[PDB]
Design a protein around this ligand. Structure first.
Ligand code: HEM
Length: 456
């Protein structure tokens, strides 16, 4: 039984002066390098505990002792994501019900049905880049976000945002992105009911009606035609919880649709952008990956089977997730009084954060060279110690989109590698912007086409 390690406290400010940054996760990582696998963090009126070692994180992942907590971010996101799967407590009736209904629609098998729609958008991306003039360049996260949003839109509810036809995004995306940005901004707002934020709260209400109006209209449209589809909306309209026997109601269906867009777009865009960041910085890995892509992707458009044979591209994406998991933290609470790691007593309801980028640099698990980009670490996934690699969270509250995200990213990165050579023409210095997610801000490349025809 030990006192919990903790950074210096500064009077009433507690540990807050140590996070005077718009990159708190990276600052927290530096604090963990100093204090080790657990420290307590205090701010005026809040206390949390940050875990970074596999040894402790494997205890935190025992679901009989700790359940998912809604961070303050998730709470503010709940004002428009409602009781969709991401922003619900595990005890909510609609959590268990939407989970049981939705899980078969997110399985590896189910990816066979979304494949044609993911290729549709992936071809539009390849075509965009094929059509650039020499001397133009690519804005990487901006184009990955066009792709992921359009793919979730199409696979999710057969709606085309048509992001590659636009300078200014579709109104629904604008409202969604501004809603998220407002929810993030609220976290560091000292005088929230001040008059200066009345414009903020009106705009926030406008963006919610825009999102709701569109999604309610498409749901009602679909119920009136009876059209069936290869989309998640179809499954939610037809599905019944095997446990209660009930279906989702229209309002919850709307929240799940908004939730897929929130949960899937930025996180999957980051994963593709970081993977392409590490490849252009490690030309020898880029060549090995491009060699796989040429060997495997023999038809003008990839089959589902082919995507599954892209094992090295898969390793690349897992190593990008090791170094910079794009959702860098998830929050947990103690369900009852407990002792963590035989040393730290926790009281019922105490909060823990899992600092995933630090977890992923546990030298006792990964070897001393943790900063190096080595996809080969993932050659044999079953040999990786249990709970060492957690970019998709944990247990029943893990990412339901994991197979969808991975299949999407493998497909797209395999086609990028097949069709283009890449140049890091600005010698880009990694700049990791933090919102709810990580992304390599300002990352730009040039792509030189290999002149390989696409398909019907
Ligand atoms: C590679 C990109 C992705 C990463 C790194 C990621 C990561 C995560 C993480 C860490 C969680 C747990 C959140 C928490 O504990 O508070 C989560 C949950 C969730 N994600 Fe993802 N995710 C990704 C892609 C997607 C996609 C493409 C979708 C949807 C199509 C999606 C939908 C969801 C949903 C609905 C939840 C809540 C699941 C539940 O609690 O029942 N994610 N994801």
């Amino acid at each position: 039984i030990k006192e919990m390690p903790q950074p210096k406290t500064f009077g009433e400010l507690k540990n807050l002066p140590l996070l005077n940054t718009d990159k708190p996760v990276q600052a927290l990582m530096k604090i963990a390098d100093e204090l080790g696998e657990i420290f307590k963090f205090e701010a005026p009126g809040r206390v949390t505990c940050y875990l970074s070692s596999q040894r402790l994180i494997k205890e935190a992942c025992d679901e009989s002792r700790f359940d998912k907590n809604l961070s303050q971010a998730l709470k503010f996101v709940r004002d428009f994501a409602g009781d969709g799967l991401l922003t619900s407590w595990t005890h909510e009736k609609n959590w268990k019900k939407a989970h049981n209904i939705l899980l078969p629609s997110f399985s590896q098998q189910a990816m066979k049905g979304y494949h044609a729609m993911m290729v549709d958008i992936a071809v539009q991306l390849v075509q965009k880049w094929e059509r650039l003039n020499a001397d133009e360049h690519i804005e990487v996260p901006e184009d990955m976000t066009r792709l992921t949003l359009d793919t979730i839109g199409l696979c999710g509810f057969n709606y085309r945002f048509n992001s590659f036809y636009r300078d200014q995004p579709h109104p629904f995306i604008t409202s969604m992105v501004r809603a998220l940005d407002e929810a993030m901004n609220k976290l560091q707002r000292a005088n929230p009911d001040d008059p200066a934020y009345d414009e903020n709260k009106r705009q926030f209400q406008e963006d919610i009606k825009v999102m709701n109006d569109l999604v309610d209209k498409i749901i009602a449209d679909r119920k009136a035609s009876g059209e069936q589809s290869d989309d998640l909306l179809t499954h939610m309209l037809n599905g019944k919880d095997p446990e209660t026997g009930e279906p989702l109601d229209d309002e919850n269906i709307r929240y799940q649709i908004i939730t897929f867009l929130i949960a899937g777009h930025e996180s999957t865009s980051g994963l593709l952008s970081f993977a392409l960041y590490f490849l252009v910085k490690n030309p020898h890995v880029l060549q090995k990956a491009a060699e796989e892509a040429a060997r495997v992707l023999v038809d003008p458009v990839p089959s589902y089977k082919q995507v599954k044979q892209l094992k090295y591209v898969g390793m690349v994406l897992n190593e990008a997730l090791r170094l910079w998991p794009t959702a860098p933290a998830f929050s947990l609470y103690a369900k009852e009084d407990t002792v963590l790691g035989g040393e730290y007593p926790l009281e019922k309801g105490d909060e823990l954060m899992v600092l995933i980028p630090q977890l992923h640099r546990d030298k006792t698990i990964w070897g001393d060279d943790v900063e190096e980009f080595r996809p080969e670490r993932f050659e044999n996934p079953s040999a990786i110690p249990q709970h060492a690699f957690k970019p998709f969270g944990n247990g029943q509250r893990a990412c339901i989109g994991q197979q969808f995200a991975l299949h999407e990213a493998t497909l797209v990165l395999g086609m990028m590698l097949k069709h283009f050579d890449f140049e890091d023409h600005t010698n880009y210095e990694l700049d990791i912007k933090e919102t709810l997610l990580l992304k390599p801000e300002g990352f730009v490349v040039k792509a030189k086409s290999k002149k390989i025809p696409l398909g019907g």
